[PDB]
Design a protein around this ligand. Structure first.
Ligand code: DCP
Ligand code: DCP
Lengths: 187, 189
């Protein structure tokens, strides 16, 4: 069973992953933020850092690819590039470069279930504040709201093409996990 | 037969490719500079443009990969990143990113050549060929760039000499001679 955990920043992906790991005994595929050489400076200037960061993300995720829970997937990385292009942090040319580059260089990738931890931006932000990553504290709400909208739109455009299972991430973790295990056991 | 044409800027790769195409009737794998959306601004500020340009180069070359003469190869692209790192146009982190990215994304996703023709050329001749061609963009950077690149081409060759079927051609010789030496070599294999 290949379990994808899908959702925006502050959705609770790593918490949910850990809880599923506890119950099934599965390995978690994580990409640790502390090992990301770009993270410290990323949010200080998006215009300067985005492209470099997003190529790094593709690389790192690909090496992990060479019974699993995926704490965020490679499907999600282009969402972050799209958001920065929407917010003019990336121009048309750089976006084309990455996009073409994503399909013709980066792009098995099969998941038994893609768990979409759908969450309001408000809750996502307060989870971000609670966690207290200094780097994430810097950018404003518009960034988070744009990203969330982009996560929902990715989901709507791809709903038929992946085995999505939507989880209300406003619910408390015990409930989320109970709904997730019930779903996993039924398949 | 897969023919790789290998050499620095102004070595005469595209001229040699065309001449070999004429004699064998082969398709030439080119990456046109006029179709490169980064080229116009690339040389104006290397610090700003290099990383973006070099990822673009990897992408473009990979799509061409999906009886051939290769007018420059994918083996050569990292040479240009190395040169910009040597000249502090790229920092350690960005260089690591690309380098790891080159092996774990690009290389990983054949790349086999029957011959890798190294058009070895002095920097002086390479520069005067650059000036003659008259690409405004290339006219902008100084000699130190070209000399660094040439040294880096020679070093790549020396480090990889045993691992590829290199055939060295003196690119100071005139084209008719180069081509005659190349055809003699091709026919013998
Ligand atoms: N393609 C990507 C992927 C991630 N990030 C950024 C957004 C986050 O600030 C950080 C990733 O943090 P985590 O992996 O810890 O996961 P999240 O922060 O999304 O939270 P959670 O996993 O709890 O939902 O990297 C990015 O800019 N572009
Ligand atoms: N990885 C790469 C590959 C190429 N270039 C640059 C150097 C040249 O200015 C231009 C390539 O132009 P051409 O394709 O015409 O190559 P040359 O000029 O090297 O060909 P020739 O040997 O015929 O002079 O792109 C680069 O910066 N990085």
């Amino acid at each position: 069973m290949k379990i994808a955990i899908f959702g925006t920043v502050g959705a609770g992906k790593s918490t949910i992953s850990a809880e599923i790991s506890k119950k099934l005994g599965y390995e978690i595929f994580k990409e640790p933020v502390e090992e990301n050489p770009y993270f410290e400076q990323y949010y200080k200037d998006l215009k300067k850092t985005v492209f470099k960061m997003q190529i790094y993300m593709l690389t790192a995720r690909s090496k992990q690819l060479k019974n699993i829970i995926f704490d965020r997937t490679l499907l999600e990385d282009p969402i972050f590039m799209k958001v920065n292009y929407d917010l003019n942090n990336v121009d048309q040319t750089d976006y084309n470069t990455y996009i073409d580059f994503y399909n013709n260089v980066v792009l098995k990738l099969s998941f038994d279930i893609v768990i979409y931890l759908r969450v309001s931006t408000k809750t996502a932000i307060s989870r971000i504040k609670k966690r207290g990553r200094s780097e994430e504290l810097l950018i404003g709400e518009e960034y988070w709201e744009t990203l969330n909208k982009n996560y929902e739109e990715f989901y709507k455009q791809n709903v038929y093409d992946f085995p999505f299972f939507v989880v209300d991430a406003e619910l408390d973790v015990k409930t989320q996990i109970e709904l997730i295990m019930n779903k996993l056991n039924s398949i």
